Amino acid sequence: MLVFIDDGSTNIKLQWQESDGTIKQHISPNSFKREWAVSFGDKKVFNYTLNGEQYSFDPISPDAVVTTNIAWQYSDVNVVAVHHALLTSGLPVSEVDIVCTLPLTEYYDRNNQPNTENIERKKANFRKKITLNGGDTFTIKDVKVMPESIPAGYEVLQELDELDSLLIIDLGGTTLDISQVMGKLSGISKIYGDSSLGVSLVTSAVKDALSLARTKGSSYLADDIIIHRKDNNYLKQRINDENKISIVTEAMNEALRKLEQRVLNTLNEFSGYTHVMVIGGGAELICDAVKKHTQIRDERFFKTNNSQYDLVNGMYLIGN
Ligand SMILES: Nc1ncnc2c1ncn2[C@@H]1O[C@H](COP(=O)(O)OP(=O)(O)O)[C@@H](O)[C@H]1O
Ligand SMILES: [Mg+2]
Numbered sequence: 001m002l003v004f005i006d007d008g009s010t011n012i013k014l015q016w017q018e019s020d021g022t023i024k025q026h027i028s029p030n031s032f033k034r035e036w037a038v039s040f041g042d043k044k045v046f047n048y049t050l051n052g053e054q055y056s057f058d059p060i061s062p063d064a065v066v067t068t069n070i071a072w073q074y075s076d077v078n079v080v081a082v083h084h085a086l087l088t089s090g091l092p093v094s095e096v097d098i099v100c101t102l103p104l105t106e107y108y109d110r111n112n113q114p115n116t117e118n119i120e121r122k123k124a125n126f127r128k129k130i131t132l133n134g135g136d137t138f139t140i141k142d143v144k145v146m147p148e149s150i151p152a153g154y155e156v157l158q159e160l161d162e163l164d165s166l167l168i169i170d171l172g173g174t175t176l177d178i179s180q181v182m183g184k185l186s187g188i189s190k191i192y193g194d195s196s197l198g199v200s201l202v203t204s205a206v207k208d209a210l211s212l213a214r215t216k217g218s219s220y221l222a223d224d225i226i227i228h229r230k231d232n233n234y235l236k237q238r239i240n241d242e243n244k245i246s247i248v249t250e251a252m253n254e255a256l257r258k259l260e261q262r263v264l265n266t267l268n269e270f271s272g273y274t275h276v277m278v279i280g281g282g283a284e285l286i287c288d289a290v291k292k293h294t295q296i297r298d299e300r301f302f303k304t305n306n307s308q309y310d311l312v313n314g315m316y317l318i319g320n
Contacts, residue, residue, distance in 0.1 A: 003091075004099045004315045005082055008148065009065065009072035010173030010199065010281065012085045015312040017320055025309050028085035031217035032077050033060045036133070046087060047133040048080055055080045059217030062204075066216070069103050069174040069195040074125050083130055086138045093135060097142035098126065099315055104177040105193035107147045112191045119145040146315060149179045150188070152279045154314040156302055162186040164274040169290070170311065171263070171282030173200035180270060192266055199282045202226055202255040209251040210239065225252065227284070256285065264293045275300040283307040 006013040014026040036054040039045045048055040053076065064077050072078060086096060100122050108114055123143040130137050149168045153160075160166060160183035168179045176194040181187075204214055206222035221238065225248060228234040232245075239248050267273065267290055276296050278286050287303050304310050 001095055002097045002099070002142075002144075002320045003086065004312050004320075005085060005096075006099075006101045006148070006312045006315065007073070007078055007082050008101060008172060008175065009069050009078075010175070011308075012081050013308050013312050014085055014089070015309065015316045023316070024089070025306075025312070026085065026089045027308075028081065028088045029217065029219065030065050030072075030077075030081055031057055031060045032064070032080040032084065033058055034064065034077075046084055048083070049131040049133055050076050050079060051128045051130075057084065057217075059215050061215050065174075066200060069172070069177065070106055072174070073101070073103055073106070074121055076125075076128065079125060079128050079130055082126065082140075083132070083137055087132070087135075091138070093132075093138055096138045096140050097144075098140050099144040099146060099318075100126065101146055101148045103175070103193065103195075104147050104149060104179055104191045105195075108188075108191050112188070147177075147179070148175060148311070149177055149279065150181055151318065152311040152314040153181050153185070153277055155317055156277065156314075157181070157183055157185055160184065160275060165189060165272055166275045166277055167267070167270060167273045168277045168279065169263075169283075169286055170280035171198065171259075171278075171286045172280050173198050173203065173282075175280065176263070178266065178270070180272065183275075189272065190270060192270060194262075194266075197259055197262060199226065199285065202252055202259070202285075205251045205255050206248055209244065209248040259285065260289045263289055267294055276302065278303040279307070279311045281308040283310070 003016040011027055011029045017023045032055055036047050037045055037056045037058045046057045106118050122145045126140045149170045153166050153168050162183040164183050166181045174195045176198055178192040180189040203219055203222045203226055206225050207214055224238050239245050283303050284307055
């Protein structure tokens with residue numbers, strides 16, 4: 001049964017429908033270590049035997065995740081993550097069939113032209129003999145593969161002018177792979193690709209300014225403040241002292257300043273923008289960034305509330 005799993009290296013983003021007739025969205029974080037942290041009681045984990053190795057969930061060190069998007073998206077850690085995501089929602093352990101996501105750097109070349117061997121490479125990854133070490137594993141039978149940024153355009157691209165362009169941006173923890181698509185999917189123009197800076201810099205800098213060590217898996221407590229940067233109420237709760245609120249804000253700002261400092265020039269490098277779509281978790285951050293520089297009018301500037309799930313919705317409506 002088809003589950004749409006945007007298997008991103010920051011966190012995995014999911015959408016599916018069941019036998020009730022209601023559509024569910026879900027998210028499972030990237031937090032899978034190359035060791036077994038077990039549990040025989042209260043404090044409950046997940047543990048896996050992967051390809052031949054020991055894997056489990058704990059609030060992981062940056063070792064695997066702070067590498068590149070490219071390195072993680074085809075990994076054994078990605079195999080843990082996708083099968084973990086279906087267990088964090090809690091689906092009936094049996095089949096899945098999946099849609100999964102590729103970088104644009106990996107999908108499209110020097111001429112920005114495509115590679116299907118990299119499509120089969122994801123399917124080959126999700127062919128490894130993973131056991132849930134306390135249950136059994138969802139069997140991924142059929143596999144569709146898409147790139148990351150592009151499929152978000154799908155539902156909007158329907159009406160959109162076929163000679164004009166839709167510039168589609170994921171800003172992630174890792175991902176900064178960007179596509180210039182054309183309307184109705186008449187073609188694709190130019191791509192840009194990067195994962196050298198992102199929200200992982202921002203969210204980790206907030207941990208330092210708080211009271212928390214530089215791991216991934218306790219990310220929420222810092223991710224909170226990246227979300228509520230437009231507030232001060234949840235900031236006063238979570239950054240629980242006024243004397244720390246500047247420190248956290250200016251640490252966050254140091255990262256965000258230097259994120260803006262590249263991505264605005266990336267949208268100078270992308271000549272021929274006409275419509276803009278902003279997606280991902282950092283969609284909110286690039287909305288605050290790129291709108292004031294690009295100066296495209298709001299009828300051609302797309303970003304919802306959901307932000308990261310905007311991507312997996314465009315994937316969903318292709319075929320379940
Ligand atoms: N509203 C928001 N404002 C700012 N950052 C956000 C927001 N929502 C999520 N994020 C953060 O953005 C990152 C996730 O980016 P995302 O694009 O969803 O992952 P990926 O790039 O792997 O696709 C996380 O650090 C997440 O906490
Ligand atoms: Mg992203």
